[PDB]
Design a protein around this ligand. Structure first.
Ligand code: HEM
Ligand code: HEM
Ligand SMILES: CNCc1cccc(CCc2ccc3c(C)cc(N)nc3c2)c1
Ligand SMILES: CNCc1cccc(CCc2ccc3c(C)cc(N)nc3c2)c1
Ligand SMILES: C[C@H](O)[C@H](O)[C@H]1CNc2nc(N)[nH]c(=O)c2N1
Ligand SMILES: C[C@H](O)[C@H](O)[C@H]1CNc2nc(N)[nH]c(=O)c2N1
Ligand SMILES: [Zn+2]
Lengths: 407, 411
């Protein structure tokens, strides 16, 4: 009941007590572990509000104070009356920082307290959302000196008035299926790239075309907006040893900004809450460039290195994978765009774990997602036992809007 | 109840019913997942259900469920249990049991081979010397001049827990580790504690970097004894690199036969505490873990120096570069000497085929993603985007405490 986690490379042992404050469910049972599965009313609301306000007032060392009780009372009144309630700016900021803090799959959480929170709950239209998003992008990008941020649009009401950003990230490349069979651009975005055209987008039908924004305000029909190009920082990819690398014509954007998740605070649901940080090198080089269902450029690179691609035993895939990732990091660093390598990020996360166990009694962590997609065992998180559990406030998944939108 | 797993690279979806036959616990609850935790005397009372469940399984596989052969065996086992408090397995049952423990090993990526297991029945063994003999025959048969063959040798089952057979070594073949006074380690740091025990038990340690450890064998709950595997039985492979000639000068070599000897085999409620088993290596076991783990030979830096890599910032990925070259060398060396080895791309590919086939013919394949995914180049292997369900089936291989921690010393 007071759980222990061991690091087998350093024998260090942490004791977890934070898990007892867990609310939501994991997917697993005593008979079956689902750790590798990607996705497993007025009465509901007040306990949720209470739990949150209780942790909020605890966090500011005013647990059981006048302010505390008064606020609990005030929210209780507003719920009974309005069948929902509003967060004070302070609670909203606390909640967003804490959703990040509780993201068990996020390796970058040592940064959690430095999140810049933009309150966009006064937004009413898609044009309004566009403006807030542009502002977020420019602030976050900061001419390459990236800063973490989240922008929070109005909360769900009766689920018929939802704000949604239809893109999965604020900034992604288009994907169009070819007559010749294969795919131009980004295969992950083929269906979305089409719904854009299907709603009016004029695709340049190129390979690295920045997708337009598709913004839904108050449950209305979504609108197309193009992010000003000067706001989209991009990095051309070159290798610091191979000059032929640049002729592959590769580039990536500097700002990773996830826009399709739902932020839950004190039982309230924020269905539009785009958030951003900065990339770990492997995210672009290993998953984005080298996944089969993506840009899949391993073969091409390996050819240009003239490796023996006859037998898998030569490890040419591994050799290329490394070079590609050396290049990504090299390109960002040379162009002064923030990026972290998987060795540094994982080392930082171990330290963050140390801190969290010490000052909070634990840190929910999902090993399947924390371990990088290359060189796993040579990073310190590989031999680190982790406990995975769900705390709130949180970021959750939510259905793609098109599967739901009552037109 | 039906459960689905999706492969997110190919969109292939599979459906698991096999998890319904799951007995043991996972460690997980609805409120906590312990999927990355390494590890999360039995009476007539609980023995007959366990026996019955096994014999049911067994007679189904041979398509004789409910036959007179089936019923008579249940009655036979029952009588023997209430009469003797345990029971004996037939050879057919032993063999079936051992194949299935491998087959149910959720952490094993090489399970495609599970039906080709050579089972040696060592239940007539009574002494340590007898154990040494059986183990030598195992090593020779399994090794087969480099053309490796999967095998398991099974010593007598536990009775009262006070007369256990144990192989004290974690693997039949492993290199000594010696802690030096300056805190440095000579040889394999993973085996220091065990090495010390051997020295204490009278082993004359040559104190080199690659000394093969002696066998420490316990028969029938007696004190363990030391035996030296004949060197001619120990196949080793010097490590060289196909392009780098300085690599051989690092003086590395590894043994060819991976043979795990500290696990417990459970079949129909019976516990086999000494059951050494072997297959062949996946390259990264030696190249990534055995050489490059910080708690192991840790030659990453030395290889990187000789490659003249930019070791100033980690973002040069020098570590990643040296790791690949070291694994290239391991495979190259083994193939050149015609000693069976499999690369991680080949092994994961085969596993996905195995797994898919297991879902069709069996209704599932328990699998521990945390252990199935290779320790380098994870996402460019096909298991990485493969959702997997983990649950525990018997027969099974289980962990057990180290014997030096539990043994009652005779003298
Ligand atoms: C600042 C540097 C950051 C780094 C280096 C980072 C890194 C990562 C990485 C590597 C993953 C694994 C996902 C994958 O492999 O594609 C991840 C997931 C995640 N990150 Fe972070 N992140 C950062 C900032 C943030 C911020 C600011 C937030 C929210 C405020 C956040 C929330 C999340 C969430 C919720 C997930 C899991 C998403 C899911 O379950 O699909 N991250 N992050
Ligand atoms: C024939 C070639 C085989 C290959 C390539 C193979 C591969 C592997 C690998 C790579 C691991 C993970 C080890 C690690 O990285 O730490 C593993 C674990 C395991 N293997 Fe296999 N294996 C083979 C044969 C066998 C055989 C013959 C058995 C038993 C009869 C077996 C039973 C197991 C078990 C029980 C585990 C998990 C042990 C644990 O949970 O600590 N394997 N295997
Ligand atoms: C290969 N992934 C597959 C996949 C599948 C579903 C969702 C995701 C998003 C993970 C995610 C979410 C937010 C992030 C932020 C803020 C920064 C950052 N550097 N990385 C981030 C990654 C990814
Ligand atoms: C460096 N890892 C740490 C670690 C910790 C506990 C146990 C193990 C060995 C797993 C194991 C057991 C049996 C195996 C057989 C028969 C063949 C084979 N190729 N590999 C095998 C691996 C490893
Ligand atoms: C099926 C597989 O478990 C799933 O796609 C996960 C595996 N681990 C991952 N880990 C990270 N960091 N990112 C991912 O997208 C995934 N994918
Ligand atoms: C804590 C962590 O789960 C543990 O060290 C595991 C991780 N996955 C592994 N996977 C393999 N194949 N071998 C291992 O030894 C480990 N170690
Ligand atoms: Zn679990």
């Amino acid at each position: 009941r007071f759980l222990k986690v061991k690091n087998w490379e350093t024998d260090v042992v942490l004791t977890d007590t934070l898990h007892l404050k867990s609310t939501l469910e994991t997917g697993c049972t005593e008979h079956i572990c689902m750790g590798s599965i990607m996705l497993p009313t007025k009465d509901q609301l007040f306990p949720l509000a209470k739990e949150f306000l209780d942790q909020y007032y605890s966090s500011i060392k005013r647990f059981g104070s006048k302010a505390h009780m008064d606020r609990l009372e005030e929210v209780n009144k507003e719920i009974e009356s309005t069948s929902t309630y509003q967060l004070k700016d302070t609670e909203l900021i606390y909640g967003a920082k804490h959703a990040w803090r509780n993201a068990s799959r996020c390796v970058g959480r040592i940064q959690w307290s430095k999140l810049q929170v933009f309150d966009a709950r006064d937004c009413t239209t898609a044009h309004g959302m566009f403006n807030y998003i542009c502002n977020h992008v420019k602030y976050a990008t900061n001419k390459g000196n990236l800063r973490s941020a989240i922008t929070i649009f109005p909360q769900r009401t009766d689920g018929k008035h939802d704000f949604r950003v239809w893109n999965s990230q604020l900034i992604r490349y288009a994907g169009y299926k070819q007559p010749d069979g294969s795919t131009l651009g980004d295969p992950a975005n083929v269906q979305f790239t089409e719904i854009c055209i299907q709603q009016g987008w004029k695709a340049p039908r190129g390979r690295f075309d920045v997708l337009p924004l598709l913004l839904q305000a108050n449950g209305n029909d979504p609108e197309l907006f193009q992010i000003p190009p000067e706001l989209v920082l991009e990095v051309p990819i070159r290798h610091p040893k191979f000059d032929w690398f640049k002729d592959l014509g590769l580039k990536w954007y500097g700002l990773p900004a996830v826009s399709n998740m739902l932020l839950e605070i004190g039982g309230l649901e924020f269905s539009a809450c785009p958030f951003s940080g900065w990339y770990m090198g492997t995210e672009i080089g290993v998953r984005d460039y080298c996944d089969n269902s993506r840009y899949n450029i391993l073969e091409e690179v390996a050819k240009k290195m003239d490796l023996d691609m006859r037998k898998t035993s030569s490890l040419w895939k591994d050799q290329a994978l490394v070079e590609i990732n050396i290049a990504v990091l090299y390109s960002f660093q040379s162009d002064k765009v923030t990026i972290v390598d998987h060795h540094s990020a994982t080392e930082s996360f171990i330290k963050h774990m140390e801190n969290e166990y010490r000052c909070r009694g634990g840190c929910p962590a999902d090993w399947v997602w924390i371990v990088p997609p290359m060189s796993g065992s040579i990073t310190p998180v590989f031999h680190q036992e982790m406990l995975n559990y769900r705390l709130t406030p949180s970021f959750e998944y939510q259905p793609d809007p098109w599967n739901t939108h009552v037109w």
